Symmetry: C2
Subunit: 221 residues, 2 copies
């Protein structure tokens, strides 16, 4: 569908656009709140600064899409393909992102020196795949990351306060300056470096993990 047709359809009050193929489209600053776009094809699309509050995008293809500064509050993105997408500074507060594919995604940019961290406060990321994602300065306060895959992700200066990290895999993840106060870490897989880098006041941990903390500050068993 082209831009003229779909703006007419939205303006007329139509909201069900599920499975629609919209690959490579240019829609900077567009506003399409409450839209049903489940299973839609949006590969390599430009959606910089768009307002998509309360959209349904479950299982949608968003690979290498530009979403810099976009609004997605309380959106359904369960199992959505976001591999390599540029989400620097975007607002995803309270969104459902369980099982979502976020491998290599840009969720916190420091490219020019300055931090453009994405907002993920209170988001559902149960079992989400974030392997290799860049989250420099991102804010994830209170998010549910039960079982999430964070292999080799960049979490430098990221805020994870009060976040549920139970069973999350952080092997190889960069955590220099990460802020994990009150986070639930029970059962998460981590490197010892984490214990020496992250702020961990109130962090809820396993016994295994507390011993690794001790060992990371030089204690020998």
């Amino acid at each position: 569908m082209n831009v003229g047709e779909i703006l007419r359809h939205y303006a007329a009050g139509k909201r069900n656009f599920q499975h629609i193929n919209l690959q490579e489209i240019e829609l900077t600053n567009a506003s399409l709140t409450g839209a049903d776009l489940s299973y839609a094809n949006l590969h390599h699309a430009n959606l910089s600064r768009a307002n998509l509050r309360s959209a349904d995008l479950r299982n949608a293809n968003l690979s290498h899409a530009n979403l810099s500064g976009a609004n997605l509050e309380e959106a359904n993105l369960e199992a959505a393909n976001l591999r390599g997408a540029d989400l620097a500074g975007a607002n995803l507060s309270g969104a459902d992102l369980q099982e979502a594919n976020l491998t290599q995604a840009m969720l916190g940019k420091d490219e020019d020196g300055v931090v453009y961290g994405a907002d993920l406060s209170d988001a559902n990321l149960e079992q989400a795949d974030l392997a290799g994602a860049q989250l420099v300065g991102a804010v994830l306060d209170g998010a549910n990351l039960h079982g999430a895959n964070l292999n080799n992700a960049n979490l430098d200066n990221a805020m994870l306060t009060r976040a549920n990290l139970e069973q999350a895999d952080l092997s190889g993840a960069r955590t220099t300056g990460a802020r994990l106060d009150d986070a639930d870490l029970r059962g998460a897989t981590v490197d010892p470096v984490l214990w020496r880098t992250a702020s961990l006041v109130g962090a809820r941990v396993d016994v295994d993990q507390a011993v690794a903390f001790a060992a990371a500050h030089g204690l020998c068993l």
Copy 2:
């Protein structure tokens, strides 16, 4: 016995003086190496800078004695009464001090600002009573403190590297700047502050203790 008699007896080669009453005597800079003084009464005596290398003083009464800078290398002081004795700067390297009473003793003075720490390297202090002793800047590298009582003792800036502290009671002990690298702490009773003050590289610890270390750096279980 008076000073003239006993210097004559030592000079003639006599060495067995066990149980002798020598209370309040003035013997500064005296040299009486290899002497048998087991069970002797030496309450409130002045022995500043004396050489007593390899003496047997088991069970001797040395309460409030001045022993500042004295030499006691490889001496037997098992169960000796040293309550309130002034041992600032003394050399007790390799001495047997098991079961000894060291309550309130001065083993490291900072009275005028400057540290006069006593030397206890490789000493046997199994089950010794050190409650309330002042050990500012003392050096106890490799000492055996299995089961020693250290209640409310001052260990500020003291070196306890590679020391055996198994089953020692450190409740209330001041440990600011203490150096415990490689020390065997398994089974010792400690306050959480210790974990935030002492240097603990290689320190051998219980699981209980490693969790207290974690908890002392703010982790919540």
